[PDB]
Amino acid sequence: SVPTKLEVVAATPTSLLISWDAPAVTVFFYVITYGETGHGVGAFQAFKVPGSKSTATISGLKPGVDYTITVYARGYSKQGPYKPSPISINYRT
Amino acid sequence: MTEYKLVVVGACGVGKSALTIQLIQNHFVDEYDPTIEDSYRKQVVIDGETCLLDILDTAGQEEYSAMRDQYMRTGEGFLCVFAINNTKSFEDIHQYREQIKRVKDSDDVPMVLVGNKCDLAARTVESRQAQDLARSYGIPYIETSAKTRQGVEDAFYTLVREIRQH
Numbered sequence: 001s002v003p004t005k006l007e008v009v010a011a012t013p014t015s016l017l018i019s020w021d022a023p024a025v026t027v028f029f030y031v032i033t034y035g036e037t038g039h040g041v042g043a044f045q046a047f048k049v050p051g052s053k054s055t056a057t058i059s060g061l062k063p064g065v066d067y068t069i070t071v072y073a074r075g076y077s078k079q080g081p082y083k084p085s086p087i088s089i090n091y092r093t
Numbered sequence: 094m095t096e097y098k099l100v101v102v103g104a105c106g107v108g109k110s111a112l113t114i115q116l117i118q119n120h121f122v123d124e125y126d127p128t129i130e131d132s133y134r135k136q137v138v139i140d141g142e143t144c145l146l147d148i149l150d151t152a153g154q155e156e157y158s159a160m161r162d163q164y165m166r167t168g169e170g171f172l173c174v175f176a177i178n179n180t181k182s183f184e185d186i187h188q189y190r191e192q193i194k195r196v197k198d199s200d201d202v203p204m205v206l207v208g209n210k211c212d213l214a215a216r217t218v219e220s221r222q223a224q225d226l227a228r229s230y231g232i233p234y235i236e237t238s239a240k241t242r243q244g245v246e247d248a249f250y251t252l253v254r255e256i257r258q259h
């Protein structure tokens with residue numbers, strides 16, 4: 001929902017450069033997750049990037065595998081914790 | 094009644110929150126909700142001695158040292174958590190330990206090395222490696238799954254035991 005227009009802008013067989021559009025409000029950080037399409041609970045890897053970024057590099061992917069990539073945004077507002085729904089795409093097969 | 098300040102640190106997505114909620118609420122959280130900061134308090138009996146667990150469940154891969162230094166200064170014990178399907182999270186442990194040592198100004202801080210998600214089939218960090226790492230640091234290693242509850246009570250209670258035996 002809240003970061004929009006998640007897309008892959010560069011690829012290698014082992015790595016992806018992804019990009020998204022920041023929301024209007026200030027963000028503390030984004031968490032990026034990646035695992036195989038249809039993975040069970042917990043079968044993913046995750047890292048964090050500052051809220052000033054709107055791209056990230058994912059490494060150590062298996063060549064020719066289909067992945068689900070998800071970007072979460074988190075921060076604080078006067079309404080309390082900012083916890084919007086993440087946005088996801090699938091890439092490679 | 095004695096209070097123990099425990100801090101759970103480690104990379105993003107390893108199961109720090111799932112572990113803590115499993116201990117506190119006896120339930121597995123299968124939804125991924127990246128943490129900002131969460132604090133929990135629970136009265137328990139460990140080895141027949143009644144005590145209060147004051148648990149800080151931190152955000153993975155904290156970007157700002159001014160944040161990190163606060164909870165590393167107040168914590169009496171640290172669960173250093175990685176995930177057995179995440180090699181990076183394993184290598185990251187070294188930095189977390191270094192940071193803690195630096196803020197404490199000591200080599201002997203009560204700590205437990207925790208390898209979570211042991212219920213997973215496809216594993217990329219072997220027990221051997223983690224046993225070795227733990228050995229070299231001079232701390233316990235506990236394999237856990239927050240999904241099945243394997244080793245969860247063991248991890249936290251062992252950390253409490255380490256603070257008691259400091």
Ligand SMILES: Nc1nc2c(ncn2[C@@H]2O[C@H](COP(=O)(O)OP(=O)(O)OP(O)(O)=S)[C@@H](O)[C@H]2O)c(=O)[nH]1
Binds near residue numbers: 153154238
């Ligand atoms: N299969 C399996 N999945 C697990 C296990 N522990 C946690 N998970 C899942 O992994 C995901 C991450 O769990 P979580 O506890 O939120 O990570 P975290 O370390 O707290 O993450 P953060 O707050 O630093 S970004 C969740 O979907 C959770 O259900 C486990 O032992 N086994």
Ligand SMILES: [Mg+2]
Binds near residue numbers: 111126127
């Ligand atoms: Mg968490």
